[PDB]
Design a protein around this ligand. Structure first.
Ligand SMILES: Cc1ccc(NC(=O)NCc2ccc3c(c2)CN([C@H]2CCC(=O)NC2=O)C3=O)cc1Cl
Ligand SMILES: [Zn+2]
Ligand SMILES: [Zn+2]
Lengths: 806, 26, 368
């Protein structure tokens, strides 16, 4: 009895895969970018990337590789999904029509097993003879690669080393050989195997096991003529080729950890590296000609090329042009010059790509239109944090950098300002105090202040409240909290009969010695006259996880307690009532007089306020062990939430249940596989303001996607479900992946068909197909006061009306 | 001479054990 | 004191039959099992239970069950939830005419009542479904940067412990910066951290070895901890109802941290003991299970000192669970209800020289 409709208003932008190769043509250089469910194919030229193709897949791309088996004019693509859908695709161009044809497809899931801690790993042998996958600990899956293997039949091989950290195939080996770094109680080791397909077994490799450094984490396969492997850890870089062994411990890389790499020269003379702080290094291998023609490695060197965004995956295109894709900041194209600038950096920025993710919080405000809404989101992290303003024109997006990590945001209309909670990192000072790393927005404010106190070289968090103008977005004011204080919640509202407006902040006192904080504050600030002043302050034995305004009162969550405060004429917070729960009330929502309380393990609770008694009263509950990330209220009966495996669920309460037990339990009436980690819910719309859809909820996720959810009537739900079923039989999905399987509710132990949700993307795709296909779809269909044979025109009008909402 | 089966305490009067039995009972 | 001894229950008589094979049913499957009437405790998986069978009908039923799966059911009383118990130790002496059967079993699984039936003979049968045991993945497995996946594996565990734990927290929950919560919040829903905290709490009640004394599995560790907490029947059944291991660990930690007073159950206000005095003398933990001469089962908790009690009887070494000790009956100073016994050594050079063993039933946890 949910009848919901979910659509995507902004496609995901975070980049998690990038590959290069001759894909669309043997004479062309192609760059493929995988962003969660989307695959983008560009052709690289002198000017830069030229978009060519863009497709959407029924899955989260977890592995992507290009291989060219013998007898192929151009390379093929191999993709794996988080649900273990494997597909081999080819790019075929016919005239002006471009399409991707599934060379092969299959499912490579095992009935019994446990996913590995380090995650899925996929590799393709250099000779293009087999595909090796690592999905479950203690097993190694092999797919033979033959032209007549369209079903992708795979066989498992036993692996003695349970904890495998890394593994890769080696170049220039007579038979398929794999070198892998694993761990055991003695330490970390590097070992080699040779894979026998005829017997489906492992055989002793060329060189035996060698004890490696206690933090080795990365393995790079050096191509011919050197061969062997290069192992990269925190404090050293080593090269193994059997008898040969050459290591170095440069003092430059000890600051951070290298977490990505990419070969530059075809022969492997040089390689790139990037660390978590953005640094970009170039590793050089020195070639030795020996004395009989044969060549061998001679020495290694490291040089700091410079600084860029927080790189997730590097790639070198040509002529020094390097594409740096980032999961936290904005993907860039940079140029590597031969002469450093005045500062010394060799990297020069060329372009930038918008990336809203990760969206940790958002709000909907009406700035100037007065009839059309706009979105303000806190994106990025570390030196990538910023504010994003989004409005309908495609979507117009504006950026405001901060150079620190924003966490929360709220809008105060009266003072025409935004209040933002932010945090920055400071290095401890051997002489006492703390030292900043770079100029952040929290330190460049025109006026600043520090809270009044009451009651080495290690990073320390410093939290600040920033007051920013709504027109110029300049940092009007900054405020700093005490040491060892963590700001969690932020709220703007009036209270009682007080006509003023305040910012209310909850903070918890945390020390690195106690599990629970056991101490915290609630602070009420007022902004006026261009100055910020602390109006009120109160102390609570606990941590304020969340706060809301509740009919002129203040509702707060302190550890496992829900407390209601009233605002007195003396400008102080006077306790009104308490209610003790068994679960940490993290997520708090309110509507009318009903309150929704949720914790991190999907324990939903419903409460009501009784003015006659002035105390709460439990109404309904729902406990089911699973990870929850968000929760929202659609109406007085239905509740929406996001839970583990990137799933959406909708619960309902039966008001007219006959017995107390029946009405004391919530029913689960909607399940859906969104494919995104929803992070925040909000109420609003991005279109100008009787209609089939009632309500509108905007949700923001980690990958940077924005989605919209609305309700429906039963007849429309039935019609759209029938249309969806009809469409699933005429749409050529990429990789031949069933829509029902893709959208099926998924967990590690349970799997149910999707119910109660209508996929907006599939319905809106009805307009792209050709007219004959439209006619075929509506064949033998009924539509509306007397039902009649439906016509394509009616469904087209319905689809336009639906797509007009977002 | 008397002793409770349940607690094991030793008594002398029948009424004593009768009233004692009530303590650890239904 | 060689805390190993109380586990063996040497007072039974030794020379006990041993079985090596074990049987496990299928999750969610429905099975029909008999129920012994005498048993009344709320059994928990992994806990050992001794029993003395007296009546001829139950003796015959046990004899039959010997060659069978050697399993029965114990209902945690109305009956809604129960525990299957596999019998592994068996003996019979037949002395004194009556057939005194001595058995020891262990809990295996948790079930919910589907139907209960009574036969003409007198024993009861019940068909019930096997509740599943659910384990959740790492809380950071949803939000994650694949490039950082290579950093999930940590070097082997060794002031030093505190630094290692700080590094572990800082490195494992890094991707927490992508969510709307701090690392220390996620650390509260972690199996390893909660297990370490429970180990620290238990260290005050014993001088045991961390590696060997407790298991390394979260489920087994949680059940072992639950089996040795002085909590009421309501609290124990509430713990049993919990499905996830993380929830049970959190509840156990909350109970240990909050509940500090132990009062008389009957009175409900006469304070008896404080948690600070709780000390363990058996490897099983502070609280263990034993059987009286007549077969009644008792859960006993050891404490250095007590109060508000009156002593009756005289010391006696007969059938004493603790080797080389006597006992005298202890009654509540107010209601005269039995609370336990006072154990005093007869030989010197004993650590301790005297203490108190209080039955679980009479205890009532109270939060100051
Ligand atoms: C055949 C026969 C012969 C004598 C007795 N005697 C008695 O019951 N005599 C009274 C008696 C009854 C029960 C219990 C005790 C004494 C002592 N005790 C605890 C004390 C603490 C401890 O560590 N071990 C214990 O078991 C009882 O449970 C009984 C029979 Cl059935
Ligand atoms: Zn008695
Ligand atoms: Zn009493």
């Amino acid at each position: 009895m949910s009848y919901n409709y979910v659509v995507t208003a902004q496609k995901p932008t975070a980049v998690n895969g990038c590959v290069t190769g001759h894909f669309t043509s043997a004479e062309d250089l192609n760059l493929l970018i995988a962003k969660n469910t989307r695959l983008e194919i560009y052709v690289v030229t002198a000017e830069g990337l030229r978009p060519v193709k863009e497709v959407g897949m029924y899955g989260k791309i977890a592995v992507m590789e290009l291989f060219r088996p013998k007898g192929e004019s151009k390379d093929l693509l191999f993709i794996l999904t988080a649900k273990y859908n494997a597909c081999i695709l080819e790019y075929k161009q016919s005239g002006e029509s471009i399409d991707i044809i599934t060379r092969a497809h299959g499912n490579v899931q095992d009935r019994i097993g446990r996913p590995s801690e380090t995650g899925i790993i996929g590799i393709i042998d250099p000779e293009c003879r087999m595909i090796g996958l690592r999905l479950y600990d203690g097993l190694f899956k092999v797919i033979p690669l033959d032209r007549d293997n369209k079903e992708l039949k795979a066989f498992n091989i036993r692996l003695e080393e349970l904890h495998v950290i890394d593994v890769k195939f080696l170049y220039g080996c007579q038979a398929p050989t794999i070198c892998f770094v694993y761990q055991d109680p003695q330490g970390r080791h590097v070992k080699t195997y040779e894979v026998s397909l005829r017997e489906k077994e492992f055989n002793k490799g060329p060189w035996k096991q060698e004890n490696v450094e206690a933090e080795a984490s990365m393995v790079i396969a050096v191509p011919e003529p050197f061969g062997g492997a290069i192992i990269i850890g925190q404090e050293s870089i080593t090269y193994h080729n059997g008898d040969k062994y050459l290591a170095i411990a440069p003092p430059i890389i000890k600051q951070s950890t290298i977490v990505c790499h990419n070969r530059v020269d075809p022969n492997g003379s040089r390689y790139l590296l990037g660390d978590m702080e953005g640094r970009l290094f170039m590793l050089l291998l020195e070639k030795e000609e020996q004395m009989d023609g044969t060549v061998t490695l001679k020495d290694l060197r490291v040089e700091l090329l410079g600084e860029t965004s927080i790189a997730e995956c590097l790639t070198y295109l040509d002529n020094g042009v390097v594409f740096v894709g980032s999961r936290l900041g904005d993907s860039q194209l940079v140029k590597l010059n031969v002469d450093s600038n005045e500062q010394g950096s060799y990297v020069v920025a060329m372009e930038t790509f918008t990336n809203l993710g990760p969206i940790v919080d958002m709000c909907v405000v009406d700035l100037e239109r007065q009839g059309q809404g706009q979105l303000v989101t806190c994106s990025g992290a570390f030196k990538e944090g910023s504010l994003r303003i989004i409005r309908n024109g495609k979507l117009h997006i504006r950026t405001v950098p901060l150079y620190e990590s924003p966490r929360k945001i709220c809008y105060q209309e009266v003072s025409q300002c935004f209040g933002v909670l932010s945090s920055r990192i400071e290095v401890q000072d051997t002489s006492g105090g703390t030292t900043a790393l770079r100029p952040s927005a929290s330190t460049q404010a025109l006026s600043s202040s520090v809270s009044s106190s009451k009651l080495f070289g290690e990073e320390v968090e410093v939290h600040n409240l920033l007051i920013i103008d709504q027109h110029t977005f300049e940092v009007l004011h900054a405020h700093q909290f005490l040491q060892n204080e963590y700001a969690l919640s932020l709220v703007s509202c009036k209270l009682g009969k007080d006509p003023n407006t305040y910012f209310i902040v909850g903070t918890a006192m945390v020390y690195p010695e106690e599990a629970e904080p056991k101490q915290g504050r609630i602070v009420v600030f007022q902004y006026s006259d261009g100055k910020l002043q602390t109006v009120a302050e109160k102390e609570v034995k606990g941590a304020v996880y969340s706060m809301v305004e509740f009919n002129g009162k203040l509702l707060a969550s302190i550890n496992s307690t829900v407390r209601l405060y009233e605002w007195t004429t003396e400008k102080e917070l006077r306790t009104e009532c308490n209610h003790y729960n068994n679960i940490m009330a993290l997520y708090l929502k309110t509507k009318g007089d009903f309150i929704l309380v949720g914790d991190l393990m999907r324990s939903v609770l419903l409460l009501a306020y009784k003015p006659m008694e002035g105390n709460f009263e439990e109404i309904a509950r729902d406990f089911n062990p699973n990870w929850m990330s968000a929760v929202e209220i659609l109406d007085d009966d239905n509740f929406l939430g996001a839970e583990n495996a990137f799933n959406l669920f909708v619960c309902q309460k039966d008001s007219a249940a006959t017995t107390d037990e029946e009405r004391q339990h919530l029913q689960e009436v909607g399940l859906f596989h969104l494919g995104e980690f929803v992070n925040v819910f909000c109420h609003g719309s991005l279109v100008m303001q009787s209609t089939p859809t009632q309500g509108s909820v905007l949700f923001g996720t980690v990958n940077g996607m924005i989605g919209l959810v609305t309700s429906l009537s039963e007849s429309w739900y039935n019609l759209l479900l029938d249309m969806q079923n009809r469409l699933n039989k005429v749409i050529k999905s990429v990789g031949k992946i069933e829509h029902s399987f893709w959208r099926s509710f998924h967990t590690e132990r349970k799997t149910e068909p999707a119910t109660g949700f209508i996929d907006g993307d599939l319905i809106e795709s009805f307009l792209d197909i050709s007219r004959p296909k439209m006619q075929e779809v509506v064949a033998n269909l009924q539509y509306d006061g007397m039902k009649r044979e439906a016509t394509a025109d009616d469904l087209i009008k319905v689809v336009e009306e639906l797509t007009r909402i977002h | 001479p008397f002793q409770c089966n349940q607690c094991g305490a030793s008594f002398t009067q029948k009424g004593n054990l009768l009233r004692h039995i009530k303590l650890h009972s239904g | 004191f060689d805390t190993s001894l109380p586990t063996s229950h040497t007072y039974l008589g030794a020379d006990m039959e041993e079985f090596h094979g074990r049987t496990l049913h299928d999750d969610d499957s429905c099975q029909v099992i008999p129920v012994l009437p005498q048993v009344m405790m709320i059994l928990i998986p992994g806990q050992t239970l001794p029993l003395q069978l007296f009546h001829p009908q139950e003796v015959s039923m046990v004899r039959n069950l010997i060659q069978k799966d050697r399993t029965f059911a114990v209902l945690a009383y109305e009956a809604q939830f129960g525990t299957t118990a596999e019998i592994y130790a068996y003996r019979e002496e037949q002395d004194f005419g009556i057939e005194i059967v001595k058995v020891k079993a262990i809990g295996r699984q948790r079930f919910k009542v589907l139907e209960l039936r009574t036969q003409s003979d007198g024993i009861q049968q019940a068909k019930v479904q096997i509740l599943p045991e659910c384990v959740l993945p790492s809380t950071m497995s949803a939000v994650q940067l694949e490039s950082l996946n290579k950093c999930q594996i940590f070097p082997s565990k060794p002031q030093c412990s505190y630094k290692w734990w700080q590094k572990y927290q800082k490195r494992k929950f890094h991707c927490a910066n992508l969510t709307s919560w701090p690392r220390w919040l996620y650390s509260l829903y972690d199996a390893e951290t909660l297990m370490d905290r429970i180990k620290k709490q238990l260290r005050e009640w014993d001088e045991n070895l961390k590696d060997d004394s407790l298991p390394s599995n979260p489920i087994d560790f949680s059940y072992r901890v639950a089996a040795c907490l002085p909590i009421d029947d309501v609290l124990r059944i509430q713990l049993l109802k919990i499905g996830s291991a993380i929830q049970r660990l959190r509840c156990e930690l909350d109970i240990m941290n909050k509940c500090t007073s132990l009062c008389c159950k009957q009175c409900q206000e006469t304070e008896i003991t404080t948690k600070n005095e709780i000390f363990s003398l058996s490897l099983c933990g502070p609280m263990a299970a034993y059987v009286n001469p007549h077969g009644y089962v008792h859960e006993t908790l050891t404490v250095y000192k007590a109060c508000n009690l009156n002593l009756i009887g005289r010391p006696s070494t007969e059938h004493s669970w603790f080797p080389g000790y006597a006992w005298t009956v202890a009654q509540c100073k107010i209601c005269a209800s039995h609370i336990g016994w006072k154990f005093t050594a007869t030989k010197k050079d004993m650590s301790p020289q005297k203490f108190w063993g209080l039955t679980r039933s009479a205890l009532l946890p109270t939060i100051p």
